[PDB]
Amino acid sequence: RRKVCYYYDGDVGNYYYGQGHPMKPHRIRMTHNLLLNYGLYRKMEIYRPHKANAEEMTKYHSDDYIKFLRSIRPDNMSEYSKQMQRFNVGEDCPVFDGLFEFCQLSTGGSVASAVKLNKQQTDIAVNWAGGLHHAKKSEASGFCYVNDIVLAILELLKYHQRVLYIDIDIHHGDGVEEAFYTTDRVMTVSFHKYGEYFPGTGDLRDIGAGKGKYYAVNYPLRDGIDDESYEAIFKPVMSKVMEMFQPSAVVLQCGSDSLSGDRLGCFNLTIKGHAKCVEFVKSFNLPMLMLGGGGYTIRNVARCWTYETAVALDTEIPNELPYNDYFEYFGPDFKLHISPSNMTNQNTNEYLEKIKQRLFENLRMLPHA
Amino acid sequence: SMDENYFVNYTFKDRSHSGRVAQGIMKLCLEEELFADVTISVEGREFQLHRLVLSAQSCFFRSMFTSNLKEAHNRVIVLQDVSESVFQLLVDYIYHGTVKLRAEELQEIYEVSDMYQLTSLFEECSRFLARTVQVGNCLQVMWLADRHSDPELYTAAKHCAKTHLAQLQNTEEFLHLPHRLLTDIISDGVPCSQNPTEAIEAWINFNKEEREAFAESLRTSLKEIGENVHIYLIGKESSRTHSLAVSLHCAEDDSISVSGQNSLCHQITAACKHGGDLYVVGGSIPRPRRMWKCNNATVDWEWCAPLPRDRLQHTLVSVPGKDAIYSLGGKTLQDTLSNAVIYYRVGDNVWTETTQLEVAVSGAAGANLNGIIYLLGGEENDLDFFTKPSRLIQCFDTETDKCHVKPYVLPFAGRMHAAVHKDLVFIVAEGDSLVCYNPLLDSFTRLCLPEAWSSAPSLWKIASCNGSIYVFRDRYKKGDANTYKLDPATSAVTVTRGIKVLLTNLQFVLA
Amino acid sequence: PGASMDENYFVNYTFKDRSHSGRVAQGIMKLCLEEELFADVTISVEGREFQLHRLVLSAQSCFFRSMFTSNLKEAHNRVIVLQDVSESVFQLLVDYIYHGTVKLRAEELQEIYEVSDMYQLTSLFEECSRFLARTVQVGNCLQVMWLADRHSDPELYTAAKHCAKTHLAQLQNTEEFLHLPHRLLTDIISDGVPCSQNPTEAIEAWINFNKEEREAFAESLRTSLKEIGENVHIYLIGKESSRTHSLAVSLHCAEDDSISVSGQNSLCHQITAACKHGGDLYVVGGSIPRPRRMWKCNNATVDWEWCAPLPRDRLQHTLVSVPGKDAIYSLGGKTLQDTLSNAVIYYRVGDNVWTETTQLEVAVSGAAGANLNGIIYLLGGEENDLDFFTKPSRLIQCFDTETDKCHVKPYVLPFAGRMHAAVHKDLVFIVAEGDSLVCYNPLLDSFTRLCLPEAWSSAPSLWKIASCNGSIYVFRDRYKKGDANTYKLDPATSAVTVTRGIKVLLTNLQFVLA
Amino acid sequence: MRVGPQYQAVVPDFDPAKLARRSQERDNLGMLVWSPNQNLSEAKLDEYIAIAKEKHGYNMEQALGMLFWHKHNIEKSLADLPNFTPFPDEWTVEDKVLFEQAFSFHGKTFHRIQQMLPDKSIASLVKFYYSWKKT
Ligand SMILES: O=P(O)(O)O[C@H]1[C@H](OP(=O)(O)O)[C@@H](OP(=O)(O)O)[C@H](OP(=O)(O)O)[C@@H](OP(=O)(O)O)[C@H]1OP(=O)(O)O
Ligand SMILES: [Zn+2]
């Protein structure tokens, strides 16, 4: 059958970003707690990720930056003002106790999943803890400290000729796209909202440079895209990318901040529309890796990721929520699926058609494998 | 036109013909007093007027001149329902279009222009009367508007008398007013603190014999409402990095006292006060997206839909007419000005995008006026990639969703604060200058200011509350909290007591 | 609006009404015409009786004001007789005075001009002068000379002088030329007559008409004679099928409706824009990705010269020539990164230095640029929308070079896309795809479509338009093998006549300059 | 989009002949805590989970982690369940009252909470706070 390895750690749920900070890593804990109660863990291999040492993290990040990260503590905050100015650690990414432990857990989960997937032991590896994709080579940004998507991809490149990275988070995956902007071995496809949104990159004309020309794909979207439009723009573009690029592994960043009703995201996707993307990607029968990242309405994130892990196992799950430790958090409807909002779709048919045709014209110039 | 050729045959329309005709008529009628053909006598003074322009300007004069009576054919016509000064002012308006309106004779001009069917002057006199209404003559203006069937002025007088119902209790004209007027002012919704029950019982007790039958109808038509003279203050303490939201309640004694105080764990980029609710935007900001709504009763925080785009120093304008909150202009995190306009539906908790602005501004002052949003000042986009202080006026019509920049320019530029009072926009800029902006006539009237403001060049925040204009100081000294009330009728300034809040920095003052 | 200190909106202020003028005008028009009330003075012309109001007449015309205020009994008489003006022209004048619109036409134009000069109606007189300058031809240029000289009108006189001196050779045998006053001949020859017209023959014929009286003026006429050279031209820039080098042809327009080639030149680079300044040709080109080189071609020497490079790289930008300031303007255009540019720069021929000025309201690329008494008009083109792509545009943008201020007209063109415009007299003729020609008047802000024969409908080919000596020539963009169709368009009757004498080995006509 | 050696990643070269050696020489960088067993009925597992949760107080994760220790032996796990106590964070009633006071005073600032509860680590305080907020 299909083997799925799930990487969870019981300590990653005890890290606090700060007072009123949007990113609460505790959302992972009830994501696991839903998994333990739906009975999905019966058909899943559960592993505990090791703590990746600083040597594993230096493959992409500069050594001084990681030395700062492992040396910075809140109790000696004032002693590294120049470092915080240089390394962009501060209001964006607050210093909290266990910062380096959290980074180690995330990157260890991603790298261990990449190694296990790289030995042909398993076909789908699920690591909701990691997925941080905004951190640059030598500076943190967007609540992301250590870029673990790029480390996981670099681990996959040791055996796979071409690795395709698929993004569905509302924001542009600027860290990983920057990391592989001049490489023809990794094709990064990102669906995001353009305009004033963070980080204000990923224009339609950003198609890489050097050897990586036409090997980076960006799909700029607008406010309030619905399930039907998202599916109708995801399926054909993905089909063309897989037909032209012909990858050997897929790394999917199942960002859950594109859902309807987040604290930060302004899309209109429901849980079914979000899981349809993962189901479509999973059907191509490629060594596939799923990571989380993003998502800031915690209950919606837990529901979405429980469904994502349910669709990975091809297991149908009841719509009602069984009693668990966090039952009171999901009230008062007490249902797994979430209804869409009344937001007006600003993605007109002509806009999507023109963008898709432009992307198709760009993809035709990609050399044959 | 397809059938017209500019070399053989075409039509010619002159765009300056109306102005030329008007100027020629004014010059020939006033300067030389030529071609006079009808004589009007008012209080013994003889006016030589032209029947053509009078008949073209007003319907009453046309009707009187076209009649078959001998008086219409008579050279001299007498008028006894007007005075000399008022009729002279009317003739000045008819022949020139420029009239000097004074408060002493506004009632007379309002009555006479209604009699002579001068529509524009009647409308302007109605607006001036609606501005000038106070607690002293609210019921007299009620009577006047009801007599002349003016809905706007009647509504303004009703709003002014309803909110001061307790003070009107011991006046003869309140006891003598008919039942319908009292029913109208009561059914509009009296605030709870005014005690409408006392008003009803006193009105009944004035003449019990002839008025008892209306008790049940008055009680059935009675409707009551609660308190919203709130002025919201958002500030940051010197020793704290979080935000404090203080809501002040204004008393009839002109003392301002704190009714509540809230603390928010996030920085705030913009804020607006919609109805009685306070909305703030701020997200630990390289990310201005989150919004929170505070209700006075709950003393808590409720998160609303995030912004469709994250912009710095945008203007949040509350539009109660459409039940929407508008975000206009603002900088981007890349220091590029943005001209996007987005409005938030309070009922549906859904954002939407509308037509962009003509000129991108950041940090402007937004004022809502009868459903039209004015963007005052800000910072334009200088051609050489930088930004400069701006003075242009932008008008956004929410009903039509069409924006256009006014050809006029403000006396000053830079950052400014706008407070809407009655039918005017009061704008306070740097350098202790106060400007009263009338958008209908599109003219400015600078208000004199006491020399005590010249000690420091600090910015001033302006807020309007229950018909009074309050001017606040942005920077508060330790133990020195000065709030200046302004009387726009006489340009007087009065210091207000009772305010003691440890707000070193007043970020936003909301009316 | 100044901030008045002594005015406040709660005690005392001045109320100024801005709808008063329109209300007064509309009411007075309605009362005076639809109802016909308060008739005061009576005017009789050729037995027809009109009822008019002395107030309106004295308000719009000074002649009527002086006539009505006279102390003579005729002013106080109820009836007044006018014998100089025809009944129909006076009806038109009354219509203009009261309503404000009048249906001008060519049959009554001279009479309306003269009468409006008599009655001191300045606006109608100026419009009639403009419309008479538009319709001037070689057949009545001397009559317009005499009229504008009698009426002391400088603009019409200058236009008639230009038309008459640019066609002096055709006026050699005309009877009016023989009777021309000596002052008019002095002015027509001293303004600068092209040497091809043989002015000396004109002087000889004028003297030979009446030698016994015109002999004394021979020396004065010869001494004051001023001559200039010859360059009636319409540069054609294009590419041949068999060559990758652009070939520029300079055609000479003869007086007998024949266009003859005066010379040709070839350039070894791609050109993205071109303009005609005075008697010289300017092209902007350069190899990809550096199209920022100017090349100046002199027709006298048939040689290329280097000029100041463009300040920034652009594609499909519009080049117009403004002889008032002796400058060449570059408007709009596209960047090498596929982004519409609103930057405007202008080049001074005398100083050979480029300078940047204020930007446009809306950036356009490939829009048509037309010159008009110093005001530069941008028509059509492409505008960017939804959101990174370009859409055919129909906006008209006006660039006033005196104040360096640009605006957007509220109206829009009847069509959109790429278009070619050539200024004619006071009008802008625009030709776009679909065999559509529109005559655009900026003063009255109106368009008139021009009917065109169905011979254009054989193929859906673009057309280029040019102006030469007041004659409109329209060319086909694509030439078939041995087929080079050029039409002379007469806008008075919308007549199209096939011209001859042109041999052109061009396949694609990139640009046509006039 | 920035391009340069200080921004992009160092992509390794692909050697087809080296595929079969590196993987077999690298150890699995993860510890296995559960693996599926196809010979075990779901009803028996549900009964064992219910017994562990009710009779012995074991939570969902610990009972299954212990069951895997005996190689999916339900009888041995049930026999050895009372022998091991599932050590929790020993939060007494006094500790709960003190943490409630700390949350009431300093809010979610766990560093200030740790001042009044020095024996409890920040991670322990954060773990307890999210479980305490359910009520
Ligand atoms: O999910 P909820 O039960 O609605 O409550 C959360 C929770 O606050 P409370 O548990 O005190 O209600 C968050 O706080 P922490 O658990 O992270 O301490 C708080 O976030 P902040 O602490 O960052 O303020 C967030 O509020 P917000 O999203 O406005 O930041 C707030 O949710 P509500 O906004 O719905 O009350
Ligand atoms: Zn995200």
Residue numbers in the entry:
A (entry chain C): 8 to 376
B (entry chain B): 26 to 536
C (entry chain A): 23 to 536
D (entry chain D): 1 to 135
According to the publication:
As a substrate receptor of the CULLIN3-RING E3 ubiquitin ligase complex, KBTBD4 is recurrently mutated in medulloblastoma, the most common embryonal brain tumour in children. Cryo-electron microscopy analysis of two distinct KBTBD4 cancer mutants bound to LSD1–HDAC1–CoREST reveals that a KBTBD4 homodimer asymmetrically engages HDAC1 with two KELCH-repeat β-propeller domains.
To elucidate the mechanism by which double insertions enable high-affinity engagement of the LHC complex, we determined the cryo-electron microscopy (cryo-EM) structures of two LHC-bound KBTBD4 MB mutants, KBTBD4-PR and KBTBD4-TTYML. In the KBTBD4-PR mutant dimer, one E3 protomer, designated as KBTBD4-PR-A, uses the 4b-4c loop in its β-propeller to latch onto the edge of the HDAC1 catalytic domain, whereas the other protomer, KBTBD4-PR-B, more extensively wraps around the HDAC1 active site through a lateral surface region of its KELCH-repeat domain. Notably, next to the HDAC1 active site, a molecule of InsP6 makes direct contacts with HDAC1, CoREST and KBTBD4, acting as a molecular glue to stabilize the protein–protein interfaces. Superposition analysis of the two KBTBD4-PR protomers indicates that the relative position of the β-propeller domain and the BTB-BACK domain is not identical in the two E3 chains. The 2b-2c loops of the two KBTBD4 mutants are positioned at the periphery of the HDAC1 active site pocket and, despite their sequence diversity, both insert the bulky side chain of a central residue into the deacetylase catalytic site tunnel. For KBTBD4-PR, the positively charged side chain of Arg312 reaches halfway into the tunnel, whereas Arg314 occupies a nearby pocket at the tunnel entrance. Mutation of Arg312 in KBTBD4-PR to alanine reduced degradation of CoREST. A basic residue is strongly preferred at the second position of this motif, corroborating the critical role of Arg312 at the interface.
